[PDB]
């Protein structure tokens, strides 16, 4: 078998995911009225609306070697030159030194030229341009997303558009939010699209919107707003959650959520809203399902469920429970007082509540300490390799990088293994003494498509930039992941390919049956007579920490 390759692009920042941090676990339990039970937490339905938008812009530069900037394209040029004929006007207008100025392509004359598809781009992010003073016209199709407020929508490039995607004039959408002058927007009725790759023209009309931002022109199809779905969505069904009362506020804790919620001790009147049919129905249905799964044989329900609004925008549904052993103590004590109703009886017998408070207290503290141990370790690995940590946290291969203290994320494009080829050598002939640290690769996004140049990354990743170069060494030997198996390289030359099952695996935590042997270092004689560094494998943490120390010494020498 062979795994699919991935060409992960660099995220621009359209999607930023903050990540949780450690907490202050109490040294000794202090919460009152401890109790276990089932819970279902609901998150605010952000209602993400995704759509594709076309971006237009031009580039202008001076041939003397200066003054390079970007500017948008007017509306008439997009709907007449580009839409009707797929061509861009040669002349371009811009502001230079706070003064109106113009330019032309090679200063030839006022003419028109057709647009051509981008050389590499992506199959899902098609783009076009007029050329691979100088003027260039560029048109690109990118994705866009909007949230419940629908006041702004972010493009795939990371730039926000302060305007509602549903704004228009066809269906009285003038009331929609907008932050641009009336002269900066235009809507066309009966508009027909034209795929520049084929120029076959659209088959049916689609009203098109057009906006001109200070840096580019954006256009998207105006679609009526869909009916609003339920305002809340099930975030996660908690199998077990402990509730504690302290400081006039409840405290909910779990082992899987890794977060503590706080409420005002008053049940939110869910009945006040007619959405109970969406939340009350889904919530109650989950309580019985979880209860029948494991609590039907050992626990008993205590009254009807409860709903509370927690800090951060979460709605927590609750169903307090108590073990059969604790139930025996309550009924036994109740019989003494008599000389069946668990509600309005729990927390009454202080002597019976004293041991359970301490018992459940250790469980809550244990989860908090364990979660802090995992959170601090997870956060460190996240900074060390956001690609692997981001991919596992979402269940699919994903690209990500840290934009300071927040992590930007984007999706990766997969490519089949039969569409990639690896070069036979990793040495660069342009300059001796330097060679690529990883094998070079050439591939195509799809079968029969154009070939592109790139470099092999980690975990079948395909890098579009060939920059992983390093001073070369003697006795080189490395294994690189390539599809299902591995590709072996020695002395910066392709040797052969081997499968995944041809190498010893240590899947288990501890394996003492490794038939290892005392390796004897064998260095070529050129290391002594020519003083050329010998191979040392990838840099260990101390090696990189020690390697930069030498750089400081070299700088001091200089």
């Amino acid at each position: 078998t062979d795994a699919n390759f991935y060409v992960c692009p660099p995220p621009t920042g359209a999607t930023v995911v903050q990540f949780e941090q450690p907490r202050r676990c109490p040294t000794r339990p202090e919460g009152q009225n401890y109790t276990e039970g089932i819970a279902v937490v609901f998150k605010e339905n952000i209602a993400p609306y995704k759509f594709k938008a076309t971006m237009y812009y031009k580039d202008v530069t001076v041939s003397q070697v200066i003054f390079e900037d970007r500017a948008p394209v007017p509306f008439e040029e997009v709907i007449d030159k580009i839409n009707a004929k797929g061509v861009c006007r040669s002349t371009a207008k811009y502001v230079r030194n706070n003064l109106e100025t113009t330019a032309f392509h090679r200063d030839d004359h006022e003419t028109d030229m057709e647009l051509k598809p981008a050389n590499a781009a992506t199959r899902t992010s098609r783009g076009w341009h007029t050329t691979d003073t100088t003027v260039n016209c560029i048109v690109e199709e990118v994705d866009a997303r909007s949230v419940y407020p629908y006041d702004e929508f972010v493009l795939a490039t990371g730039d926000f558009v302060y305007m509602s995607p549903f704004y228009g004039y066809r269906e009285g959408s003038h009331t929609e939010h907008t932050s641009y002058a009336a002269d900066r927007f235009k809507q066309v009725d009966g508009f027909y699209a034209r795929d520049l790759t084929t120029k076959a023209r659209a088959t049916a009309p689609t009203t098109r919107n057009l906006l001109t931002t200070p840096k580019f022109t954006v256009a998207w199809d105006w679609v009526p707003k869909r009916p609003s779905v339920c305002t809340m969505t099930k975030w996660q069904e908690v199998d077990e959650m402990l509730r504690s009362e302290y400081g006039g506020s409840f405290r909910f804790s779990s082992d899987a959520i890794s977060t503590t919620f706080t409420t005002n001790l008053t049940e939110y009147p869910l009945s006040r809203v007619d959405l109970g049919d969406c939340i009350g129905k889904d919530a109650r249905d989950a309580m019985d399902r979880i209860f029948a799964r494991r609590y039907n044989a050992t626990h008993i329900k205590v009254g009807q469920p409860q709903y509370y609004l927690a800090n951060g925008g979460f709605l927590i549904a609750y169903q307090p429970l108590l073990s059969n052993t604790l139930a025996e103590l309550y009924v036994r004590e109740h019989l003494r007082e008599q000389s069946i109703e668990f509600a309005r009886l729990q927390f009454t017998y202080n002597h019976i509540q004293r041991p359970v408070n301490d018992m459940l207290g250790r469980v809550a503290i244990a989860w908090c300490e364990e979660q802090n141990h995992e959170l601090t370790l997870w956060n460190e690995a996240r900074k060390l390799n956001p690609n692997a940590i981001a991919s596992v946290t979402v269940g699919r291969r994903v690209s990500a990088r840290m934009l300071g203290d927040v992590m930007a994320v984007s999706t990766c494009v997969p490519v089949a293994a039969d569409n990639v080829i690896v070069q036979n050598s990793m040495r660069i002939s342009s300059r001796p003494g330097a060679c690529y640290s990883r094998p070079l690769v050439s591939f195509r996004y799809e079968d029969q498509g154009p070939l592109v140049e790139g470099q092999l990354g980690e975990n079948n990743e395909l890098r579009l930039t060939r920059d992983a170069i390093e001073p070369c060494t003697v006795g080189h030997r490395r294994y690189f992941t390539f599809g299902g198996g591995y590709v072996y390289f020695e002395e910066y030359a392709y040797s052969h390919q081997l499968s995944r099952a041809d190498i010893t695996t240590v899947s288990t935590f501890i394996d003492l049956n490794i038939t290892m042997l005392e390796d004897h270092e064998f260095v070529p004689l050129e290391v002594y007579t020519r003083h050329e560094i010998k191979d040392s494998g990838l840099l260990d943490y101390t090696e990189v920490q020690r390697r930069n120390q030498l750089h400081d010494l070299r700088f001091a020498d200089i």
Partner: antibody
Amino acid sequence: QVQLKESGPGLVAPSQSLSITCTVSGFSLTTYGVTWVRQPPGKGLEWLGVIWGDGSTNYHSDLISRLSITKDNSKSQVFLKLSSLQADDTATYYCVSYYGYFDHWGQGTTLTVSS
Amino acid sequence: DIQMTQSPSSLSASLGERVSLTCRASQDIGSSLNWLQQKPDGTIKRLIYATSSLDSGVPKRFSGSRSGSDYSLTISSLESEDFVDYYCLQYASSPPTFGGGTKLEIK
């Protein structure tokens, strides 16, 4: 300009599966959706479902178990399906586009369920 | 779901008389409300969309407005053809729901 026309059997037996096709022109189905509405004799209108530009669809809670809608973008036709038809299913079915919110409506087809 | 209540179920008026209808929503729907008209043969036509925005080509006599949680439709002068059915419709929350309907008859 936008127009919609329905096409169905007109008469069907109870407990069988219904099939109605609505031909629409004036807008692309790849971007806009189509909604279905019915009206029994002497009663008000009733919403059935809707199919947006994408493959997503929404159905009424009283007909989700039996209602099903599909489409073809090349032919600009939307197919309506309804299984396990009862006696009270006799009603005039209409297909209403989303070029607007409910701007254009079709003529409608009168369907009767009886053996 | 949002339930729409239309009143009156029926109305009596003379030719050229000024009448008005009202439709109330159980929950907030904003400006997302439309008024429809059905011909005797079953043809459905939209009159007002998005709360008081006259439809393309609709007669000027038709109109609409909002008053708090109540939405209304008004006809300046009634003609012999306007004596047909009318229905209020909402589309703010899923699923859209129609009103109870109103029939206009001669006085």
